[PDB]
Amino acid sequence: STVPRLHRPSLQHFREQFLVPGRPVILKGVADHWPCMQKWSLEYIQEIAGCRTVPVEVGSRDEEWSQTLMTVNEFISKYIVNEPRDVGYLAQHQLFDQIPELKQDISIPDYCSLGDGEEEEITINAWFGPQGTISPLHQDPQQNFLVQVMGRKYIRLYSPQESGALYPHDTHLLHNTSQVDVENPDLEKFPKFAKAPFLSCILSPGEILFIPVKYWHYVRALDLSFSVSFWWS
């Protein structure tokens, strides 16, 4: 079944029915009027950040992801517009600490204040990449508000209760990552994955997905996509 969509729910309503229990939800009417929703085009991102060095993750379309450095202009040029030869992702980067002028175009969701951490310790990451970027099925150690700004993203969510049916890697460095290709699972090797229930959604611009702490999430970009994630506790 699908992730429920709620429009500007109260802090208490979000705290009691989702944050505390750990239930995913899509929040509407919250970030749809953030400045990023009208300003951030490729033309705008180049003007404000084109000459800045950003980390980019590259990988083949069972291959393997390496990490390099290049200017935003370079990234867009040879991973977004010019019929890219490989997949490049400006992923998990604190672009807004590097570029404060872009931090004016977003805010911190008020729902974060319901956490036991400090606002200064919230990690804001930019996920800027082309159609086709795919995360592995994985779980993070903090709460997360995934704000979609450009394009859409298909996202699958498995509860932490389903960890057994997701076959996590046994190396400590990857114990938070699933061995299973979500959208083409090897059921002969990972049979328990087939009967694991899940939530799914297509996250579209203006929307915020609340990924509870340690909720397994799988993300695939359907179009040219720019997402901003808020990791908070």
Ligand SMILES: O=C(O)c1cc(C(=O)O)c(NCc2ccccc2C2CC2)cn1
């Ligand atoms: O908000 C979140 O928790 C979140 C969002 C995304 C996203 O792609 O939007 C995400 N993808 C990870 C991913 C994809 C493609 C190559 C590499 C990587 C890894 C970072 C090394 C993971 N986590």
Ligand SMILES: [Mn+2]
């Ligand atoms: Mn994640």
